[PDB]
Amino acid sequence: AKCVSYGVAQIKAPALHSQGYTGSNVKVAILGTGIDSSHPDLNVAGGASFVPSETNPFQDNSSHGTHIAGTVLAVAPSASLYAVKVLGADGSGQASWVINGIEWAIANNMDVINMSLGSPSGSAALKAAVDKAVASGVVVVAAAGNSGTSGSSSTVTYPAKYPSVIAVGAVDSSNQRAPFSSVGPELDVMAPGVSICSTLPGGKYGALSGTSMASPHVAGAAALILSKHPNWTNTQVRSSLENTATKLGDSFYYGKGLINVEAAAQ
């Protein structure tokens, strides 16, 4: 990755890189606003758009998909990226579009799905789609939400709120929970999500913040893990990440804590 970001080191990805593991032969679907395939540092292997007003998945008129894609590659430089456009330029999309993108990912034999997106409500159909993906062997990772806290209530968004999906909250460089990061018993793990520098459309770079930024660290970590252990099931990859996380505090706020890909891939 051409923009330096602390998050890669924080999750202990360089340790895998030094072992020789970079996520080769792992197909990662980036479900979001598209990916700018013209960026010189991003190669996109395939994709599809489900946003009727924005028909090209290989451009990104938001910036977030491009950024996220870059973070997956910063963590897993050999991963194969697929651009699955389910949100428009303003970051919004319809439930059905998301589901369409999930279906696409299952049909095209994705290894990992990253969903840096959320709604305060889901649907039985969305639950069925993610549960089908998990039954099919896909590692399914989602941003936990940017709804902060709500007393004792969970503020984790869908689809992260569904049990079959790995729900990823955001910490800063000091492992403190970001003020925006959603909370609740559905949180699984945390990853860097504050001022993360990555690729932007038009050959640019810059920092963004959000649980959107934390999710691709975990998607990239899953790619690293699968490169070292291509026979592990999605269940085993998930267990590896959760069981070896660095505990940070109360699980309502932090889940199992910060992912440690070095430990997870042992």
Partner: peptide
């Protein structure tokens, strides 16, 4: 709606 986080 779903939204980018």
């Amino acid at each position: 709606l779903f939204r980018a986080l």
